[PDB]
């Protein structure tokens, strides 16, 4: 129902690997905010919205629209 299987957890762990490269901010509120972006959203959704939210996960990973420091 998402774009694929491995891609979702790949982007997840990739955001965590940027989560340790985070430098200035409270990293646990950061990680809890990653949770609330992923826990309450990625449970019981239609297969189309899975695509769009993994695409905003893609863009949130890349950070050409800004990056958390």
């Amino acid at each position: 129902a998402p774009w694929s299987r491995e891609a979702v957890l790949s982007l997840y762990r990739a955001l965590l690997r940027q989560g340790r490269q985070l430098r200035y901010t409270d990293r646990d509120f950061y990680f809890a905010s990653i949770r609330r972006e992923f826990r309450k959203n990625q449970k019981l959704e239609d297969a189309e919205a899975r695509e769009r939210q993994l695409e905003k996960g893609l863009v949130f990973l890349n950070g050409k629209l800004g990056r958390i420091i």
Partner: protein, 111 residues
């Protein structure tokens, strides 16, 4: 100088309750650094506002413009803009409803 490092010094020296900044890329021509920070209450956010304008005003940068604290009368929100950066002192509930951390990372990719 008064950099974002100095801002981290001012806010962790105040012990701000919650910190999350975004480096705004130069195309989206608002600012460079977008600080989102919460505190205890109106007294806390208010006092740390007067603290950071106190330290910027007292610190350096005479030729740079004096900076007005916005929303002194409202309770939950407070915001202060500089040359490079803009800080938003608010409440984490107010943060929950205005969801700014999503916006400045997802410019067209959110609600």
């Amino acid at each position: 100088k008064f950099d974002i490092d100095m801002m981290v010094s001012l806010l962790r020296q105040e012990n701000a309750r919650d910190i999350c900044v975004i480096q705004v890329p130069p195309e989206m021509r608002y600012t460079d650094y977008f600080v989102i920070v919460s505190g205890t209450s109106t007294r806390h956010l208010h006092a740390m506002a007067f603290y950071v304008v106190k330290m910027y005003k007292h610190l350096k940068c005479k030729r740079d413009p004096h900076v007005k604290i916005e929303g002194k009368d409202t309770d939950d929100w407070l915001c202060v803009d500089f040359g490079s950066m803009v800080i938003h002192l608010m409440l984490p509930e107010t943060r929950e409803i205005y969801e700014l951390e999503k916006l400045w990372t997802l410019r067209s990719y959110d609600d």
